[model samples]
Target chain A: GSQKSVDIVFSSPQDLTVSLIPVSGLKAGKNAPSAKIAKLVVNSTTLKEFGVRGISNNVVDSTGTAWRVAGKNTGKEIGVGLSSDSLRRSDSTEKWNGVNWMTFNSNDTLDIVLTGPAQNVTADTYPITLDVVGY
Target chain B: GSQKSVDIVFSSPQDLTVSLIPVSGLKAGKNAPSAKIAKLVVNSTTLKEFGVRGISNNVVDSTGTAWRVAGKNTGKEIGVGLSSDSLRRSDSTEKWNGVNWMTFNSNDTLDIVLTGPAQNVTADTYPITLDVVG
Candidate 1:
């Protein structure tokens, strides 16, 4: 396991507006057959924190299906482990109500990935706010 | 689930240069703790198809660690299931080798979540190429 870049997307295919704060990186085996992302999650609290306009900000995906996006960067990324569809209404706006992932967290288990040689990595050292800009 | 926005970022946070080809779709329990992502992979083969510079493209991460990016959109998403860090660097430029995920593939298994009723969606109807603009 040398590299740690495994991303699962839920936004407009090539357009990334939301993002995860770095957490558990990627872990894969050499010539194995699969890569592993440990823990990651995002929900109502995170969305609002990320600066969603208002409450009940239900999203309509490309497929016309409704969905909510969440999770952070990097052990696969331990999830907040919450599930709640509680929602509210703002005027006619989808008010602030939280929805937890009632499924993903229950299916986590992995192993096997060839190792990579140790190398150098420059850390932020001071650790900045880690701002994320839309791509 | 009413929405379909579940993303696992790989590029520098917030910055997305690489992306998936939109596959299966997200299936979640009404208020489930997990959102299922089926199959997705980016081995040497697909990487090149995506127009990755040359041969092997070993990359380094913000964590100061080395890494590679891969996968597609939508069945939580199905994976080609491959793993072989066959790397190739052009002198200094990360060459055109390939790497596979021997783990992610083996971990596909799940269940549960309420369903979304129905709605209207404007399809390309004629079925366009679904060109992904980075």
Candidate 2:
């Protein structure tokens, strides 16, 4: 039942694209269960004002377990949920469970990259909430 | 005399961006003095882990006075302050007060951009304190 929530606000007038903003912290140790991203919710009622299309989740870990979540790539989008759950879940039990998990090491990192439709959009403080079950 | 502080925690596995984090609020009005960045102190004992070499001071002001502090450039390092001063001042009065000052306008913004050796660096929470003595 260990949960942590982070609220990120975007205030740039230009359309945000692939911008990495630090949302939360990860632990530093050996074989430690670092941050596991469970859910991502865009709560800005006026998100369209800034053309915030979506967000890409990227992780820098030691064991390289995070890269397996999506594919052999930089990062992957949280895609749609099943059965109306509407929340993305990681592959804790299964391989590539469609969720991103972090390896507890000093080199571990959890970043959120925001993307928009185009550049130069109106400026607004849009809030995006992240759900970290446990680190 | 007004003073404010911001605690920036760098937990990213890579270097930070030229992004602006809302540290302290700035007043908005005609001839209003915004957030004047006075001093920047990097106190990370393990800074070398991330190769944190230096920091770049940039400001988006209305009066365009921040540019005068360093010269014709976006920003300049605080550099060694005058003897006994040891702190950079803003251009408030007497033409380029030798200190960095922020003009209080709705479009005014105070930002800090961190620099390092390379792109990817070790993750750590370093403390950089700014002095705004008013």
Candidate 3:
């Protein structure tokens, strides 16, 4: 289990790209042990205006199921069985619908794309904290 | 010296954009002091099969030199003088050319772009641990 935190500031109103690259004291890969997200805390007084706009990853289940197809629009209700097939898409081209749960394997990368009102998210640094409990 | 760890899992073959924006109690600009990458450790037994394929950044040296130009193709041989002029460009258009040293002044924002093969990098969380001694 591990946790990390970082700050993100928006000088101008635009889509902020945040990347979560896993680097534990363990070696993980597509066939390695599964990496799960124990807790994800995105805190900020202005978060109501931001929230999670979208996510990008191609995580799948051991059954070879695609999370994107099964997890679209689930939001936070995705539960623990979360895979890329169920994760939301929040890239420039794909709009973030919603997903409840967050889980990843060695072959998964959480590319969370955040969006907010351009007029409101300027000239300040917003704290984005994340906590992970995984092997 | 400081260190942080995160897990990255890729389901399909894709280019991941990892950003490092400085918030070390200072507002860094293109002319700021700079954020130097002290150490970067990409640990994986399979790394030999999927080593760092490329990188991307817009860091400039104190001398107003872009890392892509000053530091291109130097690879790990870049040493400490690692100015932007000596940093490499590992983007799709640039390739993992080579870079020896790594440094960032106020104007530098490390936008590390990592790439690997899809067929081999499936179903695992490659431990990409980073140690920053700057």
- TM-score, one value per model: 0.17, 0.23, 0.26
Docking class of 3: incorrect
Where in model 3 is the C-alpha error above 4 Å? A1-19, A22-34, A37-50, A53-135, B1-31, B36-39, B44-134
Candidate 2 chain A, which ten residues in sequence have the lowest lDDT sum? A1-10
DockQ for all models: 0.02, 0.05, 0.05
lDDT of 2 at A134: 23
lDDT by residue (A63-128, candidate 3, tens digit) is 212232122222221212222432442221212333333333322334322211111111111222
TM-score of candidate 2 on Cα atoms, chains taken together: 0.23
Cα lDDT computed for each candidate against the true fold? 0.22, 0.23, 0.25
Q: Candidate 3's error at B86, in angstroms?
A: 13
* CAPRI grade of model 1: incorrect
- How big is the positional error of residue A62 in model 2, measured in Å on the Cα after superposition? 23
Candidate 1 ranges with C-alpha deviation above 4 Å: A11-17, A20-135, B1-77, B81-134
| Tens digit per residue, CA lDDT, model 2, A25-60 | 221122122223222222222223111112224433
Task: For candidate 3, give the lDDT of residue B133.
Answer: 17
Give lDDT tens digits, candidate 1, residues B19-121. Answer: 2222222322222222232212223322223212111133232211122223232223122111122112111222223432111111112111111222112
Best by lDDT: 3
Look at candidate 3 and tell me the lDDT of residue A118.
Answer: 17
Q: What is the TM-score of chain B in candidate 2?
A: 0.23
Top-TM-score candidate index: 3
- Residue B23's lDDT within candidate 2 is 25
Cα displacement (angstroms), candidate 2, residue A122, comes to 40
